[PDB]
Design an enzyme around this catalytic site. Sequence first.
Site, mmCIF file in Angstrom:
data_model
loop_
_atom_site.group_PDB
_atom_site.id
_atom_site.type_symbol
_atom_site.label_atom_id
_atom_site.label_comp_id
_atom_site.label_asym_id
_atom_site.label_seq_id
_atom_site.Cartn_x
_atom_site.Cartn_y
_atom_site.Cartn_z
ATOM 1 N N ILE A 112 41.484 45.874 52.332
ATOM 2 C CA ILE A 112 41.956 46.520 53.631
ATOM 3 C C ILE A 112 43.356 46.944 53.560
ATOM 4 O O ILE A 112 44.215 45.421 53.493
ATOM 5 C CB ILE A 112 41.523 45.951 55.034
ATOM 6 C CG1 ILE A 112 39.860 45.722 55.596
ATOM 7 C CG2 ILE A 112 41.949 46.256 56.510
ATOM 8 C CD1 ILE A 112 38.946 44.971 56.557
ATOM 9 N N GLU A 152 34.667 41.015 52.611
ATOM 10 C CA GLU A 152 33.688 39.068 51.944
ATOM 11 C C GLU A 152 32.193 39.011 52.072
ATOM 12 O O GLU A 152 31.831 38.798 51.413
ATOM 13 C CB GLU A 152 34.490 38.369 52.617
ATOM 14 C CG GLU A 152 36.286 37.396 52.763
ATOM 15 C CD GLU A 152 37.246 37.457 51.408
ATOM 16 O OE1 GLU A 152 35.926 38.493 50.784
ATOM 17 O OE2 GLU A 152 38.002 37.196 51.385
ATOM 18 N N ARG A 194 31.605 41.508 48.906
ATOM 19 C CA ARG A 194 31.817 40.287 47.828
ATOM 20 C C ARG A 194 30.610 39.511 47.159
ATOM 21 O O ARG A 194 29.977 39.269 46.486
ATOM 22 C CB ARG A 194 33.027 39.988 47.126
ATOM 23 C CG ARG A 194 34.224 41.071 47.529
ATOM 24 C CD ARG A 194 35.357 40.399 48.022
ATOM 25 N NE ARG A 194 36.190 40.977 47.723
ATOM 26 C CZ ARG A 194 37.446 41.303 48.584
ATOM 27 N NH1 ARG A 194 37.619 39.737 49.496
ATOM 28 N NH2 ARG A 194 38.238 41.826 48.426
HETATM 29 N N1 LIG Z 1 41.436 30.003 35.044
HETATM 30 C C1 LIG Z 1 40.935 30.318 35.878
HETATM 31 O O1 LIG Z 1 40.256 30.454 35.982
HETATM 32 C C2 LIG Z 1 41.864 32.096 36.111
HETATM 33 C C3 LIG Z 1 41.728 32.222 37.447
HETATM 34 N N2 LIG Z 1 42.169 33.403 37.800
HETATM 35 C C4 LIG Z 1 42.139 33.252 39.679
HETATM 36 O O2 LIG Z 1 42.981 34.411 40.470
HETATM 37 C C5 LIG Z 1 44.110 33.983 40.405
HETATM 38 C C6 LIG Z 1 44.221 34.277 41.901
HETATM 39 O O3 LIG Z 1 43.750 35.061 42.902
HETATM 40 P P1 LIG Z 1 43.322 35.992 44.621
HETATM 41 O O4 LIG Z 1 43.909 36.763 44.064
HETATM 42 O O5 LIG Z 1 43.663 34.558 44.815
HETATM 43 O O6 LIG Z 1 41.483 35.592 44.753
HETATM 44 P P2 LIG Z 1 40.477 35.840 45.047
HETATM 45 O O7 LIG Z 1 39.049 35.892 44.953
HETATM 46 O O8 LIG Z 1 40.183 34.655 46.607
HETATM 47 O O9 LIG Z 1 40.452 37.368 46.118
HETATM 48 C C7 LIG Z 1 39.066 38.318 46.231
HETATM 49 C C8 LIG Z 1 39.552 38.461 47.760
HETATM 50 O O10 LIG Z 1 40.221 38.211 48.889
HETATM 51 C C9 LIG Z 1 40.444 38.178 49.657
HETATM 52 N N3 LIG Z 1 41.245 38.718 50.386
HETATM 53 C C10 LIG Z 1 42.586 37.689 51.172
HETATM 54 N N4 LIG Z 1 42.864 39.176 52.265
HETATM 55 C C11 LIG Z 1 41.824 40.442 52.400
HETATM 56 C C12 LIG Z 1 42.447 41.799 52.603
HETATM 57 N N5 LIG Z 1 43.317 42.030 52.872
HETATM 58 N N6 LIG Z 1 41.429 42.780 52.302
HETATM 59 C C13 LIG Z 1 41.018 42.311 51.642
HETATM 60 N N7 LIG Z 1 39.883 41.266 50.698
HETATM 61 C C14 LIG Z 1 41.205 39.370 51.421
HETATM 62 C C15 LIG Z 1 39.287 36.198 49.788
HETATM 63 O O11 LIG Z 1 40.758 35.321 49.130
HETATM 64 P P3 LIG Z 1 41.788 35.064 48.335
HETATM 65 O O12 LIG Z 1 42.108 35.008 50.030
HETATM 66 O O13 LIG Z 1 42.032 33.636 47.452
HETATM 67 O O14 LIG Z 1 42.139 36.416 47.789
HETATM 68 C C16 LIG Z 1 38.104 37.364 48.863
HETATM 69 O O15 LIG Z 1 37.433 37.056 47.769
HETATM 70 C C17 LIG Z 1 43.299 32.155 41.406
HETATM 71 O O16 LIG Z 1 45.001 31.336 41.293
HETATM 72 C C18 LIG Z 1 42.710 31.569 39.574
HETATM 73 O O17 LIG Z 1 43.105 30.991 39.246
HETATM 74 C C19 LIG Z 1 43.616 33.803 37.230
HETATM 75 C C20 LIG Z 1 44.096 32.781 35.761
HETATM 76 C C21 LIG Z 1 42.820 31.775 35.821
#
Ligand SMILES: NC(=O)C1=CN([C@@H]2O[C@@H](COP(=O)(O)OP(=O)(O)OC[C@@H]3O[C@H](n4cnc5c(N)ncnc54)[C@H](OP(=O)(O)O)[C@@H]3O)[C@H](O)[C@@H]2O)C=CC1
Length: 247
Positions: A71, A160, A163
């Site tokens: 968002i 969410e 997704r």
């Molecule tokens: N070894 C592995 O498997 C590896 C994986 N990746 C991964 O990616 C990294 C981080 O990803 P991340 O960005 O945390 O991802 P997420 O899947 O959590 O982010 C996607 C979406 O962000 C959320 N969200 C938060 N605020 C909003 C908003 N305003 N609008 C919409 N959606 C929202 C939720 O999670 P959230 O709040 O967490 O964002 C959500 O499912 C990890 O550290 C992880 O390791 C990368 C490298 C290696």
Amino acid sequence: DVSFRLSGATSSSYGVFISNLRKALPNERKLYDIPLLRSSLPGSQRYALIHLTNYADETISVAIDVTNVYIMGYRAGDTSYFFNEASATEAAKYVFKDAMRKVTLPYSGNYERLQTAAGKIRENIPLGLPALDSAITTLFYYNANSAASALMVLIQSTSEAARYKFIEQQIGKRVDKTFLPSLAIISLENSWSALSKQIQIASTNNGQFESPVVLINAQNQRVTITNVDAGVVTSNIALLLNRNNMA
Ligand SMILES: NC(=O)C1=CN([C@@H]2O[C@@H](COP(=O)(O)OP(=O)(O)OC[C@@H]3O[C@H](n4cnc5c(N)ncnc54)[C@H](OP(=O)(O)O)[C@@H]3O)[C@H](O)[C@@H]2O)C=CC1
């Protein structure tokens, strides 16, 4: 644009709104029958508007980036509100241009910031239709002190749910009541990114992930997910974030 009205809403009608929102997002292709979101789109194709109206007929319009379902900001009447982050600054060049005033929220859109501003973690914030009605109201009559938690209800009930099918079904089921999300919900939200990357890798590695993902299931057990035959890939996740859209 996609719309949802809470007056006369049912489980079914909330299911129709979340599938309409999934249908509004362009996809690269599909991997294991799951749509892969695009990695970059011009600004004129990049945002989609959702209009949400509460039981009192009060409506807000919410802008979403179609490459990652995040968002960017929302409009209530003649005022627009945008998160304090680079991508939202780019979105403001393209959406809600005819709003009279633009307000920059003091936080970016991530949960660690929002939880801080609300003073409440996600597991103690109620979800369900009636909690969405309440979030609508709070953001329409913008109350700085109450907005961060209203925005968390907003994000979990739109992005969410889009997704993951399990989030969509738990939310749509509460039509006249409210519930606190279990850690299975929080863990899926936490791990969208990681799971999307591993699915893409698995497609070139005979369905096996390169690095396992630790989830929390319904019994509250930590489970180690390592490949595409796991239930979460086969029958839950509904949108994949492009590998180039994390980076
Ligand atoms: N070894 C592995 O498997 C590896 C994986 N990746 C991964 O990616 C990294 C981080 O990803 P991340 O960005 O945390 O991802 P997420 O899947 O959590 O982010 C996607 C979406 O962000 C959320 N969200 C938060 N605020 C909003 C908003 N305003 N609008 C919409 N959606 C929202 C939720 O999670 P959230 O709040 O967490 O964002 C959500 O499912 C990890 O550290 C992880 O390791 C990368 C490298 C290696």
